[PDB]
Design a protein around this ligand. Structure first.
Ligand SMILES: *S(=O)(=O)c1cccc(S(=O)(=O)N2CC(Cn3c(-c4ccc(Cn5nc(C)c([N+](=O)[O-])c5C)o4)nc4cc(C(=O)NC)ccc43)C2)c1
Ligand SMILES: N[C@@H](CCC(=O)N[C@@H](CS)C(=O)NCC(=O)O)C(=O)O
Lengths: 209, 209
């Protein structure tokens, strides 16, 4: 198997790259890291920024989830068909990252106090991606151009975890909803999304969702 | 003039890309947006994510500073020599981003209370970049490979603003220090870093630093 994913037993910042790997018919080894292993200290100390995911593609070793996604996109043709489209994919993914940061802050540092304000503010954070969809072939293909990209898998995961956090949060965004259903029903992705290696994992690392 | 930058009269999220543009001998028109004009509300409602910088290259239009950086590096040859080096540059820029986010957070939401602990934690946040330099040509060329990349400009700007925040914070990191000196000696970049266009601006939108 060409790829190794080294992460905690969490969906987290690895859910999107896992989706990408599964939907593209790739195989990969999961190295699961428990609390005991991480506290041991040597794995962490070997990690560039002392964090996970760690990712192996042959004898290339990568850290940072967004770096990993861009890498897979580069080498599996999921980065747009020209340089202009590649910039657009960078835009979209960076917006996805900003919102994911806000989500992670809510989850890990302010769930009970912040959830109401967060759900009240969420439609403003989702409207940019519906605008994006509506300007690209009526939103009936992918988020950028007419072929799938790594930003699609990233945006999809962000949308799914938000539909967990605030159910019905996509009712006001018909295009984003049809987009979730369409990408979710792709066959290899569907299979992965229903497998135990996905369902048995919590979204996050602190029991909140 | 091919390029248009549309950001507040600040350095902020634009200091790096400007640096790159100046160092590559590029010309660009600056459109300056005051807080009064911003607070009017129209330009903000036309911004994809409600933020600036907004960037125009021909009739391609971009938002997000990292998107702009990656686009400039893709089109100017500052994004590695092969796919592996591009992935390493990504890994570096994302590390830079994380630290930049911590810095932005401090600067805007907790300067007085949080500066002391920010400074105490800074060496561990810098140690990875010292390690990277030590494994690429003795730290005596660039952060990745043997030619400059957009990650170099973003990292340089990060280090400069941290030296202003924590004087001598590079005392313990000889390679990062010599790096700041070397890249700043580059002719076009030195010229730009002493010009009024750069010098007359505050590091951040709220004058803290
Ligand atoms: S850049 O101008 O420094 C910049 C950095 C990050 C984000 C942006 S922005 O999205 O385009 N945007 C403009 C405004 C930043 N800003 C402010 C200001 C003071 C307090 C806040 C609220 N806030 N902003 C940020 C980034 C956070 N945060 O914690 O992440 C918070 C809570 O914004 N004041 C400003 C004054 C000027 C100016 O014209 N000075 C002479 C410019 C920008 C600016 C948020 C921009
Ligand atoms: N910027 C990183 C963030 C990864 C991250 O913070 N992961 C957490 C998992 S909850 C972690 O590594 N925590 C361990 C630590 O910092 O010791 C990425 O995108 O990969």
């Amino acid at each position: 198997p060409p790829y190794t994913v080294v992460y905690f037993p969490v969906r987290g910042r690895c859910a999107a790259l896992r989706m990408l790997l599964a939907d593209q018919g790739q195989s990969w080894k999961e190295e699961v890291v428990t609390v005991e292993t991480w506290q041991e200290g040597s794995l962490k100390a070997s990690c560039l920024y002392g964090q996970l995911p760690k990712f192996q593609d042959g004898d290339l070793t990568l850290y940072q989830s967004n770096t990993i996604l861009r890498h897979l996109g580069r080498t599996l043709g999921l980065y747009g068909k020209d340089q202009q489209e590649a910039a657009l994919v960078d835009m979209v993914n960076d917006g996805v990252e900003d919102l994911r940061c806000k989500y992670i802050s809510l989850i890990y540092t302010n769930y009970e106090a912040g959830k109401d304000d967060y759900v009240k503010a969420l439609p403003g954070q989702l409207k940019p991606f519906e605008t994006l969809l509506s300007q690209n072939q009526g939103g009936k293909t992918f988020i950028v151009g007419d072929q799938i990209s790594f930003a699609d898998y990233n945006l999809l995961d962000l949308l799914l975890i938000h539909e967990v956090l605030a159910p019905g949060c996509l009712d006001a965004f018909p295009l984003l909803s049809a987009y979730v259903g369409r990408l979710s029903a792709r066959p290899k992705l569907k299979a992965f999304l229903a497998s135990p290696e996905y369902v048995n994992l919590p979204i996050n690392g602190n029991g909140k969702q």
